Paper text:
Pathogenic bacteria commonly employ the Type II Secretion System (T2SS) for the release of protein toxins. The system includes an inner membrane platform of GspC-E-F-L-M, a periplasmic pseudopilus composed of GspG-H-I-J-K and the outer membrane secretion channel GspD, called the secretin. In numerous species the targeting, assembly and stability of the T2SS secretin in the outer membrane require the function of a small lipoprotein that binds to its C-terminal region (the S-domain) and serves to pilot secretin monomers from the inner to the outer membrane via the LOL lipoprotein sorting pathway. In this study we used cryo-electron microscopy to characterize the structure of the secretins from [name] and A. hydrophila and in addition determined the crystal structure of EpsS from [name].
In addition, we also solved the cryo-EM structure of the [name] secretin of [name], which encodes both an EpsAB fusion and a GspSβ/AspS pilotin (EpsS). Analyses of top views of class averages revealed that, for both secretins, symmetry is unambiguously pentadecameric (C15 symmetry). The resolutions of the resulting symmetrized maps were estimated to be in the range of 3.4 Å for [name] and 3.7 Å for ExeD by employing the gold standard FSC criterion. One of the clearest differences between the two types of secretins lies in the outermost region that is positioned towards the exterior of the cell. In [name] this region is covered by a ‘cap’, formed by 15 aligned β-hairpins that lie on top of the membrane-embedded region. This region points towards the inside of the pore, closing the structure on the top. [name] [name], however, displays a well folded S-domain (residues 588–649) with a clear α-12. The Ala-Phe motif is present in [name], much as in its counterparts from V. cholerae and ETEC. Interestingly, as in the case of GspD, α-12 from the S-domain of [name] was in a conformation that did not allow for EpsS binding, and our attempts to fit EpsS into this region led to clear clashes.
Numbering used by the authors:
A (entry chain B), B (entry chain A), C (entry chain C): 600 to 649
D (entry chain O): 449 to 460, 475 to 599
E (entry chain A): 248 to 267, 283 to 375, 390 to 460, 475 to 499
F (entry chain N): 500 to 549
G (entry chain B): 248 to 267, 283 to 298
H (entry chain O): 349 to 375, 390 to 398
I (entry chain B): 349 to 375, 390 to 448
Amino acid sequence: YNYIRAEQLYKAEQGLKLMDDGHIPVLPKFGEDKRHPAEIQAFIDQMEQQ
Amino acid sequence: YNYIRAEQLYKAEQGLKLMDDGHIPVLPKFGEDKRHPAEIQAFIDQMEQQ
Amino acid sequence: YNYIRAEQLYKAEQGLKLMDDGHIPVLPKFGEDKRHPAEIQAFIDQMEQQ
Amino acid sequence: SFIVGEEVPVITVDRKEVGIKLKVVPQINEGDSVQLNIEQEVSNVLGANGAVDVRFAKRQLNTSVIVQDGQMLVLGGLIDERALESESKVPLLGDIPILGHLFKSTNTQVEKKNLMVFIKPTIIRDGMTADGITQRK
Amino acid sequence: YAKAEDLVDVLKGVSDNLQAVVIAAHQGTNSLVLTAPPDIMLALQEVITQLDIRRAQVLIEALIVEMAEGDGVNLGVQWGNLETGAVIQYSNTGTPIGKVMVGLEEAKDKTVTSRTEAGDYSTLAAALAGVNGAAMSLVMGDWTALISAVSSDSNSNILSSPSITVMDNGEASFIVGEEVPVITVDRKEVGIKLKVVPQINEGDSVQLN
Amino acid sequence: IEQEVSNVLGANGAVDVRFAKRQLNTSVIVQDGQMLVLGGLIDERALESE
Amino acid sequence: YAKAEDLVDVLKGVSDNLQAVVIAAHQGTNSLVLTA
Amino acid sequence: VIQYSNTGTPIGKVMVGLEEAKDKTVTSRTEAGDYS
Amino acid sequence: VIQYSNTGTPIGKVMVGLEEAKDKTVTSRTEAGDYSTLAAALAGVNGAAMSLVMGDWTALISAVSSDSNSNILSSPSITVMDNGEA
């Protein structure tokens, strides 16, 4: 799992060529379950703050 | 559920592109069941007031 | 196994003709299981260092 | 059963229903804990690109779960993400950072699909309870 | 907490055997009706009370990670002189110089003596049609050198995860797919399927089939 | 109760005519003279494309 | 740790033979019911 | 050509199409080419 | 001819093709010959089929050093419970 994740994080360093680097599927850190995309996470807290 | 709702609320911040932002389906707050669209809710109270 | 590996390491000395020599599948050293491609391994440590 | 759909007929000619189906055998337990034996299908007759007859696009999820009275529980799911890059280039000329794009043809595609099915059993014992459930609706 | 339609099956063996007794399950109320001798009764009651525990339930989240990465380089230069049929052609490259030179001659304006006629590019289009890279022609005094190059660098990173929730020891299917029909006509489902018969063990160690 | 509204539509793709069927067959228990809600469906969709 | 649906099969031979007994496996709870 | 299949259209089809969509001359008549 | 089948193309097909690809004359009209026969000949030449045309003796020299190479390394693991089939 941790090997795939390494590969995929890589492909995030050299991101989806013409897209925003955020859309490239990446496994979460092993046993952390999903983390929301940043923009949405940023939105969610802003909502929480409000 | 709460993750989907986050996504969908997002898509409401950056709303249905050419429509009125209100039509974009959004899950209700978990265990709140549905809330009427605002316009209709606004209408209903007005009726109640009358 | 060790005979195939020899052949394949060879084909790495005289690498995939027009590609980067790194892409040519090579069996790992017998009972070492896989080693990540270098670039990714280089990336992973950098991440670790960070 | 519940099916809001269409019965498309399909060669074998049988007439298969293809819609939002939901076929629950809800069986209420002690502690107001409903134990549903659910078969839930959203499906959506698409074209038959290649195939003999029409290809139904079916997302069925048939399971047995055990839910509280009035709390939702998540039957099912699927979080697909895809990301296909492609770049054909004139090998080495498609390397140059500025002008590369003149010789390269890049094709990037990212599909992300979140299908969760939640289910919420509500127990209607007292008539008065039904009035509400129903009325509200 | 139990379906009685299924419990009556199990009590059939406890029932008759113990006597050496009619157990009947009334679907409606999920209540099975026992007509026992008093011991057999007190017995069936102690069996039903221990089979009638709540079932725990597993959220089977599968996590299919298909990550595919392809890199091709075709580079190959083809010389050709059709005046005097001299090719250095290669099949391995997109197009072979023959098709291309023939196509180029057909795409030229012919003359049948005086009329002129514009040649069909139908043969040149069938040649160049299949060139996925760069098939450039340095035409050097009637020796057409078609240089071909393509560095097809593909990449795929599919990460589909379907979870199903299921009651322990229940079977549960999940299919997010399409039923394509296929000659034999049967209609086979073809998608992300996941059909787990999760069976929870002591030590909270789920044993999935 | 077995309750079906259905409404023979075209057979776009299919051999014969596709019936558009909304059947809802259940067993409920209602008061004398109060209404009860057998069934339902609240679909919302929202497809953007650009 | 065992599927009882399959264990009842094996205990059929231990069961009758030993007596010379109804073993029944209740799928649901992966609990087999012995009446020995 | 430096054509690519991966993009909507490949320059070959397009250049051929553009030549066919041009007005040809069969000597003197003129003819308007099909944009088919 | 000194032809060989073993090589990509045989000089016969090639010389016939070359004559058909030449502009004929039916007396005065001129006509441009179809390269359909020459294309069927040269079509199948995977190497180098060069013609030193020496006063009407066409010497088609053919050479190809097809050096292929394949190195597939597919490893599938399955996890299975002992004595279970998987």
